[PDB]
Design a protein around this ligand. Sequence first.
Ligand SMILES: Cc1cc2c(cc1C)N(C[C@H](O)[C@H](O)[C@H](O)COP(=O)(O)OP(=O)(O)OC[C@H]1O[C@@H](n3cnc4c(N)ncnc43)[C@H](O)[C@@H]1O)c1[nH]c(=O)[nH]c(=O)c1N2
Ligand SMILES: *[C@@H]1O[C@H](CO)[C@@H](O[C@@H]2O[C@H](CO)[C@@H](O)[C@H](O)[C@H]2NC(C)=O)[C@H](O)[C@H]1NC(C)=O
Ligand SMILES: *[C@@H]1O[C@H](CO)[C@@H](O)[C@H](O)[C@H]1NC(C)=O
Ligand SMILES: *[C@@H]1O[C@H](CO)[C@@H](O)[C@H](O)[C@H]1NC(C)=O
Ligand SMILES: *[C@@H]1O[C@H](CO)[C@@H](O)[C@H](O)[C@H]1NC(C)=O
Ligand SMILES: *[C@@H]1O[C@H](CO)[C@@H](O)[C@H](O)[C@H]1NC(C)=O
Ligand SMILES: *[C@@H]1O[C@H](CO)[C@@H](O)[C@H](O)[C@H]1NC(C)=O
Ligand SMILES: O=[N+]([O-])c1ccc(O)c(O)c1
Ligand SMILES: O=[N+]([O-])c1ccc(O)c(O)c1
Ligand SMILES: [Cl-]
Ligand SMILES: [Mg+2]
Ligand SMILES: [Mg+2]
Ligand code: NA
Length: 585
Amino acid sequence: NYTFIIAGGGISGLTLADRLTEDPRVTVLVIEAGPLDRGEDGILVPGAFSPWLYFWPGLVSTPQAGLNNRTVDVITAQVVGGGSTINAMVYLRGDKDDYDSWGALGNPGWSWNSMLPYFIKSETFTPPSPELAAAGNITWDGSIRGRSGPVNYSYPNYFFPGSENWWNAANEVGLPPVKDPMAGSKQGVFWIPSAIDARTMTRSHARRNHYDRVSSRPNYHILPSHLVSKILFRGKQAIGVSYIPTSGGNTTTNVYASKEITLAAGGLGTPKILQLSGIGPRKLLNELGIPVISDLPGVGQNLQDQPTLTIPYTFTNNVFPNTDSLTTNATYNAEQRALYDSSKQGAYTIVNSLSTNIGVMSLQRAAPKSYRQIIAAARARSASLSLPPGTDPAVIRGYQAQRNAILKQFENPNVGVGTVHWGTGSSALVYHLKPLSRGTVNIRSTNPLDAPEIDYRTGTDPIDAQVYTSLFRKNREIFNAPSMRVLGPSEAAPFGANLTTDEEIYAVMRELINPSNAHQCCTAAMMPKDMGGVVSSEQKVYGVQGLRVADISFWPFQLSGSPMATAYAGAERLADVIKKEHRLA
Ligand SMILES: Cc1cc2c(cc1C)N(C[C@H](O)[C@H](O)[C@H](O)COP(=O)(O)OP(=O)(O)OC[C@H]1O[C@@H](n3cnc4c(N)ncnc43)[C@H](O)[C@@H]1O)c1[nH]c(=O)[nH]c(=O)c1N2
Ligand SMILES: *[C@@H]1O[C@H](CO)[C@@H](O[C@@H]2O[C@H](CO)[C@@H](O)[C@H](O)[C@H]2NC(C)=O)[C@H](O)[C@H]1NC(C)=O
Ligand SMILES: *[C@@H]1O[C@H](CO)[C@@H](O)[C@H](O)[C@H]1NC(C)=O
Ligand SMILES: *[C@@H]1O[C@H](CO)[C@@H](O)[C@H](O)[C@H]1NC(C)=O
Ligand SMILES: *[C@@H]1O[C@H](CO)[C@@H](O)[C@H](O)[C@H]1NC(C)=O
Ligand SMILES: *[C@@H]1O[C@H](CO)[C@@H](O)[C@H](O)[C@H]1NC(C)=O
Ligand SMILES: *[C@@H]1O[C@H](CO)[C@@H](O)[C@H](O)[C@H]1NC(C)=O
Ligand SMILES: O=[N+]([O-])c1ccc(O)c(O)c1
Ligand SMILES: O=[N+]([O-])c1ccc(O)c(O)c1
Ligand SMILES: [Cl-]
Ligand SMILES: [Mg+2]
Ligand SMILES: [Mg+2]
Ligand code: NA
């Protein structure tokens, strides 16, 4: 046996396994669906970024009712290190009220104040060079960035010149410099912190910082290329798991834990292990003939992501060099790669197609003249309208509680709802951080090799389009500001300056929005059971003992931010919670 078995070796699972194995008396087995990465340049080198190397195969959405019935490929990691291995390295905390809100949903011990020590513990920030900080407008608050923890983060050591035009344009249209977007607010523009190790200018993924770093430990066991197919019980006690080869061989093996089973299989993997195990909605489990261990209608409910929109541009006078120079100028690409290979300088320190700065805005900052109208529409509409009729009443109550917290965020000048970015080339990116829409992920069968049904339900809540349209218009203000007009931008078809009404704009958005930035969360939510929750404030699955959810399945709702930094910090916090209960070193 092992002391603990962890299902999924992604950000959350490896962070937890690392910390638990600090006690030599504690053995851990991490069972991970994907292989070890091979240190490929497409993983390690930012400018070579190749995320597709380790996408989970064979996942497709249902037709998306809110997006013209489009079906999309579903993107999530299948590799040791999980999303950290293949993500764009964007390393950002949420805003204070995100965590305060999770606490106010009925989770004692959850707040910005309680998370801050764990954000700090998680990481080591390496400052940029002083000349780059001065030239680039890179600022930070050293008091609230970690100095000693395992996740390395820093910045690229270069910026494209057009990033300057964009920064000044953003400032011209009400997005001011942010001193530190890690300080619990991020209203305006700032350099993107990147999960890079500055001594080599390579990715600091969880494979490295929470496994390789500590892989001399004989008590830290890993089994790549295997799937946890079921949790095993003695009565209501979780005692073990079954696992199978990911490649589908007709072999099944049982392994047992003396203390706990931890699920860390991600937003799209954790609910499937629970449902196959008899933990889930009795309607679904009864339909499939799965005996019910714990009737929890929230399992697989409440799916969220953070939609994206790519806006195409042409320019009469774009500045050289820019991100597209890497793809259209072989000489420039070769010279920048040679530069990186020699002295680790230049464009290859930036994740491919990204720039170095970004903007985040509250609803009132996006829509100063109309945000009250959006809030009124959202306040007027019954929460139940966002979910199908016959949704479990506990799931509706939890959704209503989330919705009320998000409407307070809409009123808050210090909580973000959307992002604007320009890579310096042919497209801009606009992200919707705070959707009110909610989706599902449900097993289709008892076959552990079968993909679940994944329905994002993007744009089913009509408030989302109102918010997203406002974010689009703010992006258009940046491109129209004096500092950007000198580059001669114009929106390209199917967008265009000739689309002036909300209806004209959103009709194109409905055809182009991607439901996902691979930020899937919230499908095993941490809320009271009578609110459709799956886990307690201690991340224990209701109705069974010895079973927790560590991955971002547990989140109630999305952050003003991207998930990675909080995925690390939340697993740092859970490690301490488990150590305290079991009196570990
Ligand atoms: C391409 C891409 C791009 C981005 C991002 C993701 C991806 C895929 N993200 C999102 C972020 O990386 C993600 O939200 C976190 O990795 C989630 O961490 P978890 O621990 O919840 O799951 P994570 O996905 O890290 O790990 C879950 C693991 O479980 C495994 N698994 C699933 N089912 C299993 C089973 N039954 N048995 C065994 N193993 C199983 C999977 O193979 C996977 O490795 C991101 N975030 C951000 O902040 N900045 C960014 O730049 C980006 N960009
Ligand atoms: C990545 O973070 C780690 C953790 O803070 C840094 O590791 C320290 O590195 C210094 C110098 O090599 C050592 O003196 C310390 O003993 C290390 N501390 C730990 C606890 O490992 C590492 O330096 C970081 N990377 C960069 C670029 O700073
Ligand atoms: C999507 O499909 C449904 C039937 O499943 C249909 O009623 C609806 O009109 C379609 N939506 C669009 C935008 O075509
Ligand atoms: C930095 O900010 C200053 C002051 O607004 C501005 O003049 C300058 O162009 C900015 N540079 C970059 C690279 O953002
Ligand atoms: C797997 O092996 C068992 C035991 O031999 C057998 O009964 C079953 O048919 C096999 N299943 C498949 C999918 O081949
Ligand atoms: C291509 O890049 C090189 C190397 O930086 C530069 O000298 C040249 O002018 C570029 N060519 C074009 C057409 O931009
Ligand atoms: C509107 O502009 C778009 C984008 O350039 C172009 O496709 C289209 O021809 C324009 N529409 C009309 C009516 O000219
Ligand atoms: O969710 N998606 O659709 C994504 C997210 C990130 C990616 O790099 C990608 O190629 C697709
Ligand atoms: O700046 N932010 O807050 C961001 C940046 C990137 C993201 O993908 C995100 O979801 C939020
Ligand atoms: Cl491997
Ligand atoms: Mg220095
Ligand atoms: Mg300055
Ligand atoms: Na430098």
